[PDB]
Amino acid sequence: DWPVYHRIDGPIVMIGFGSIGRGTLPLIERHFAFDRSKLVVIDPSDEARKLAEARGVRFIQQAVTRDNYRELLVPLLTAGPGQGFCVNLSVDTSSLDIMELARENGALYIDTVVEPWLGFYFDPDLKPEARSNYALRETVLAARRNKPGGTTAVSCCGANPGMVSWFVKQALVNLAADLGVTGEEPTTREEWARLAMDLGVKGIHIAERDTQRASFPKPFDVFVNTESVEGFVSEGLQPAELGWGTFERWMPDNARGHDSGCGAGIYLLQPGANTRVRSWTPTAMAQYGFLVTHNESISIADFLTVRDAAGQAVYRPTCHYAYHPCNDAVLSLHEMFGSGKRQSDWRILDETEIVDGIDELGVLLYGHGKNAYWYGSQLSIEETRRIAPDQNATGLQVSSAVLAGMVWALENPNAGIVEADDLDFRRCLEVQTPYLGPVVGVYTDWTPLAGRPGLFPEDIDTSDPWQFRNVLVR
Amino acid sequence: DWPVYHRIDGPIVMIGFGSIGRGTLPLIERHFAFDRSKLVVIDPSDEARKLAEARGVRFIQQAVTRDNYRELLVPLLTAGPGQGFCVNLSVDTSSLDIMELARENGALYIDTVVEPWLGFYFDPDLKPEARSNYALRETVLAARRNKPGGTTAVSCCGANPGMVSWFVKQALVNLAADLGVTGEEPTTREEWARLAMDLGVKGIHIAERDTQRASFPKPFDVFVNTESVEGFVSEGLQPAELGWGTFERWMPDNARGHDSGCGAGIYLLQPGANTRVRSWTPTAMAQYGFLVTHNESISIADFLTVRDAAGQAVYRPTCHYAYHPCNDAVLSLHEMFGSGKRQSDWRILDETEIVDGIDELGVLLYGHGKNAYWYGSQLSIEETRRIAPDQNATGLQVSSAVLAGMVWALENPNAGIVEADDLDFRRCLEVQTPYLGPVVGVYTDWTPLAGRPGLFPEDIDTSDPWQFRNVLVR
Ligand SMILES: NC(=O)c1ccc[n+]([C@@H]2O[C@H](COP(=O)([O-])OP(=O)(O)OC[C@H]3O[C@@H](n4cnc5c(N)ncnc54)[C@H](O)[C@@H]3O)[C@@H](O)[C@H]2O)c1
Ligand SMILES: NC(=O)c1ccc[n+]([C@@H]2O[C@H](COP(=O)([O-])OP(=O)(O)OC[C@H]3O[C@@H](n4cnc5c(N)ncnc54)[C@H](O)[C@@H]3O)[C@@H](O)[C@H]2O)c1
């Protein structure tokens, strides 16, 4: 039977019941003990209501807004008897305002993204710098400094951001042994950054390849994806964004830094979902990825930053997304940007519609003695159906990572505001690994200069294959 | 009751039996009168032989090379009793050499491309400018100057290059009439160029959208297309090319002109199949197109050039391909360029495999008073199966254009070396129209500046939306 990790003796408030909420709720009932009536789901859509009613769970058909979130949520969070848990899996809501609301009411909190109130993503008056995830992330870092410690609030604990942070630590451990780097396993942020520096890790790709396919072809004028379309399109239209490593010798003309913050990121003045990079995964081998902005791009580079006594950074890795979505999403991207506007409709591929395919999601560490090393999951839809209901392979990697964040938080309920990089990676993977299918590490001799230059003059840097000048596609 | 247009009183030698050869052979048998034993096919492929054997057609399994084409084609084309016809529908053969050989022995000739001998396209010792279709077309133009007149030989008479030259003439006449400009239509090149100048036609997209899809999904590591894969990938890896209009005020930094020749073209130092442009078709609306180099991009711009007394160009339209192939081909291109290498296998979708779709292929005249006007064919696969065998919608548009060009050559056998721009377009479209499905003209108020600028800074020219500055994706 499945392990029941803890009893939750308080209200469980799930904000948003979309593709990820539908997959997470079954996992919460499976691995936690509690009275079913103590759970409550909040979502404005009629489709979510009918699903919630099919589960016999309390439902409030309401959109959480800046105007109503205090009056709406505080009664739900303080209903008792004990400590409540706010599980935020929504769009169009401010992760920071809800997070702060839960903390000051003594309720645990978890989400999978730093989401802003509706209007932010397309606000015409915001500068590209303020539209970046770097800026959104700095609002959570500022909150953590203004109110250190307290009730635990786990920020950005999905598959990516989230799971991949744990994969980076396990990958670093594996690389140390394989490169025969002597030493004791790191137990602090400073020790981890120092290990990556000592291993010669110049950068990291969040290298992903989704091969799931449906029984019907991509409909015309319909955006298709295996997870949130609204969320993917929104982040796809934000600036391309990456953690900027100290080994880089070149950035493009339309790249910009930040005047304040942790200083670990840059951004390009162009949408990320229409920005290609050269990357690599085990199933796909050499492929194009899209440089979509993610929280872990900034948080991983910042976490693995080494500073001198003066506070200046002397080592940090490059880190960014390299996303090859399912073929219907690639076509949807080609369609959307080719038209200049969102499609008239969208849909998320369901477990009942997907014929085959996997979601290969891992971290690719490069620049070290063995060139490149990819570590991550290869979960298949066949395995997904066999172990978890109401979700495809993309959704299970995410929902299982929310399960591990919830377990860690109940076991560490007074750790303050934390990101996935602050969680005990070994305990989190122990919870999640049953839902990840094969988890493997693989070396490769491939580099972004393979087969280059070709028959056209090209702006490459042959001294160092992994320079961003060689990765970025023009 | 199919019309039989002409008797062919000599040998019919068809070089190549791929997708286009298979679709063209039934049309030759259908529309021309000749003794069955006069037609012979030459193709080195084993798959081709078995097909031809099943049609009861003579087949010589041999590659036409530089070291054998004289001793092979001369006897075959001069077998008598009178004039033969060389139908060249192959890859890796020299169109020019075979064409000059046919003319030297009084045989008519037609092809759909200026193809070089094997080894030319990927030769590392060639500058990009030498690998341009502009350079190839100049060899044909020079051959015409060195031997004016003589036996007719039709260069590049397929769907595009070929049929789209006739669409431009019809579109120009339609635009005039829609403006209330009656009167005698042009009958010389000078008058045609003047008409385009007088109507304010700033440029022309060969605007195409293929919607044919297969009963199976895109297989991994396979390049899929509705026509020649080897032919498509070769031109896709050639530099991007376009006829360069006199109204253009900007070109990229990696754009180059030519020192010699007609002087109508530029090229970019990047592969066309990885270069995107903003265009439009009736069924697709606003879409991305690929800037694949094509012969008609130059010949149309050249044909519609107006010069002053000194010989300098005072008007010329911009002209280039804006190709949106089928979805599997879009995926194939993403896969080929993302990995940096041709796939291990390829296949051309057969009519038995295609489940639905059309080949929407026409010309988009822009810059005039009515903004933009699309004229062309919307042939569907369903109508294709009802009227012609052994081909899909893409192939039928090509084979029927070859049919049209053969009719014109047989009717005008002493015209010398000619391009599709030099043919009687009303007679050619009279022959081809039964195989083009809906042939319609559509006006649109769309421009490349639709919805721009976005949330990012952009280098655009708001005074003239159709400037290549705004069309080219950057
Ligand atoms: N880190 C990761 O790995 C990861 C992976 C997938 C999704 N996500 C994120 O998780 C979130 C949920 O993803 P999903 O696939 O379920 O998205 P989805 O679009 O399928 O679901 C969104 C749900 O939120 C609801 N909603 C919209 N506005 C709301 C409001 N104002 N208040 C309350 N609810 C509202 C909708 O009714 C819908 O049911 C997204 O924001 C996405 O960015 C993260
Ligand atoms: N203008 C147009 O509208 C248009 C459209 C499609 C294709 N084309 C052109 O038509 C040509 C044929 O197209 P397809 O779809 O039939 O291509 P295909 O790849 O389906 O067929 C090519 C054939 O040429 C044969 N071949 C290869 N080397 C040869 C040699 N040395 N001698 C004789 N035969 C040889 C192959 O065996 C093959 O059967 C291509 O060159 C392509 O560029 C033009």
Numbering used by the authors:
A (entry chain A), B (entry chain B): 3 to 476
Which statements did the authors publish about this structure?
Bacterial HSS is mostly found in α-proteobacteria and in some β- and γ-proteobacteria, including pathogenic strains such as Legionella pneumophila, Brucella spp. and various P. aeruginosa strains, including PA7 and PA14. It catalyzes the conversion of two molecules of putrescine (PUT; 1,4-diaminobutane) into one molecule of sym-homospermidine [HSP; bis(4-aminobutyl)amine] as the main reaction along with several side reactions. Bacterial HSS is NAD+-dependent, active at neutral to basic pH with an optimum at pH ∼8.8, and shows increased activity in the presence of 50 mM potassium ion. BvHSS forms a dimer, with each subunit containing a boot-shaped substrate-binding pocket between an NAD(P)-binding Rossmann-like domain and an HSS-like domain. The cofactor NAD+ is bound as a prosthetic group in the binding pocket with its nicotinamide ring being part of the active site.
Apart from the exchanged residues, all residues in the binding pockets of these variants superimpose almost perfectly onto the wild-type residues without considerable deviations. Regarding the structure of the inactive variant W229E, the location of the carboxyl group of Glu229 is probably not completely fixed. The carboxyl group is rotated between the two subunits of the variant and the omit maps reveal a lack of electron density clearly supporting the location of the carboxyl group. A reduced occupancy of the carboxyl group at a defined location due to flexibility of the side chain or radiation damage affecting the carboxyl group should therefore be assumed. In any case, the side chain of Glu229 is able to protrude into the active site, as modeled in the variant structure, which would sterically interfere with substrate binding. In conclusion, the inactivity of both variants W229E and W229K is not necessarily caused by their inability to provide cation–π interaction but might rather result from steric issues or an enlarged space enabling increased flexibility of the substrate. Still, both variants are inactive as expected for a cation–π-dependent reaction mechanism.
